[PDB]
Design a protein around this nucleic acid. Sequence first.
DNA 1: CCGACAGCGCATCAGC
DNA 2: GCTGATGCGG
DNA 3: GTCGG
Length: 326
Amino acid sequence: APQETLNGGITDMLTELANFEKNVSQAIHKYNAYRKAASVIAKYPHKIKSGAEAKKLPGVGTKIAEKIDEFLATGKLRKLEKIRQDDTSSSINFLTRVSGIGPSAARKFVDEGIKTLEDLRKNEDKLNHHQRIGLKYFGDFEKRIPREEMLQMQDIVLNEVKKVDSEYIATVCGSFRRGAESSGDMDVLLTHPSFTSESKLLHQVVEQLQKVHFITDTLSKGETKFMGVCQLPSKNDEKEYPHRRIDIRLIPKDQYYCGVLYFTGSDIFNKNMRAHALEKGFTINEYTIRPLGVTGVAGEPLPVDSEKDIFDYIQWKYREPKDRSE
DNA sequence: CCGACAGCGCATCAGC
DNA sequence: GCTGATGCGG
DNA sequence: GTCGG
Ligand code: NA
Ligand code: NA
Ligand code: NA
Ligand code: NA
C-alpha cells in the first residue's frame, strides 16, 4: 500500500466526511460512498494532482473531485471545517464511538444535553445494558489486538470448547485467519455434528468460557449468536490485559464451511468469488452454494464438507486464507 | 431520471 | 400479553 | 455520492 503521505490528507478528509454522513446526517449510503472513495484513493500509488485525476478512479465522482480541488488549493475544506467546530454535530459524531450508541441514540443524548463520556457516566439509568458495557470499556474497545494475544485467546477458546464436547468444531475467522498482524476483535464460528439445517449447543460453550473467567460480559446472547467481552488472564504482578470484543456464532454443520469462508473474507475477495461463482453458474452466499439453472432459478443447496468443496464447484483452485486479500 | 447501495440476530421499542 | 418495527452491530 | 439501467 502507498505511503499514508501521498494522499493521506485527501483520504483523511473523505473518511471524516463519511463519519458525519453516517453518524450525523444518517445517510448510510453517502457514508459508504465516501468510504469507497477513500479506499480507492488510498490504493492509488501516485500523489494526486487534481480532482479530475481522481475522478478517473471508480467511486470518485463529480462532487468529490470538486472537494479535492478545494483541498489541494487551500489545504482544507470549508464544509468540513465548519462541522468540526459545531458543538452539536461533533458531540453526536463522538458519542457513536460508544458500542451500542448509534446515530439515533447519539442524537437523542445530545438533544437533552448528554454530550461527553463524563455526561454518560452521570446518567446510567438512561443507558441500556449494551451501552453501559460500551461505556465501561470505551478505551479498551478502541485498542487493537496484537496477533500474539489473538493466539493466546484462540488457545483458550479451542481448549475450553473441546473440553465441553470434543466433537465441537471451532474456527477463529476474520483477518486473524488470513494472517493479519493485529485484530480489532475475535470472531469464532462454532459447529457440532448434532446440528444440521434440519434438526443449548452455544450456551454450554459460553458458560464454560465464563466459568474459567475468559468471557467477562454479555452484550447479546441467543440460541445461535453470542456477542460479548473477554480478557486474557494477567500474569501475577503485571499490567492487566485490555478487555476485548468477542463474537461466537453457532452455524449448522452443513452450512459451516460457507460461513467460515464468508467470515474469513476479505470483503473484496468475497465479491469476486461470488462474481466468479455466478459466471460459472453458481450462487454463493454466507450459508450455501446453489446452481443457477437456464432461467436463473437456483436449485437446492449443494453438499459442502470443506472450504475446498466450494472452490471445486466453481472451478477455482483453493486459495489459502493468507492469499485472500482480494 | 432515479433506484440500488446485504441482509440477519438479538435487544428493545411501538402498536394493539 | 403478543407481533412486528426499529436500532445496532459487524 | 456514485454508479448504471
Ligand atoms: Na469516477
Ligand atoms: Na461507532
Ligand atoms: Na456506537
Ligand atoms: Na468426547
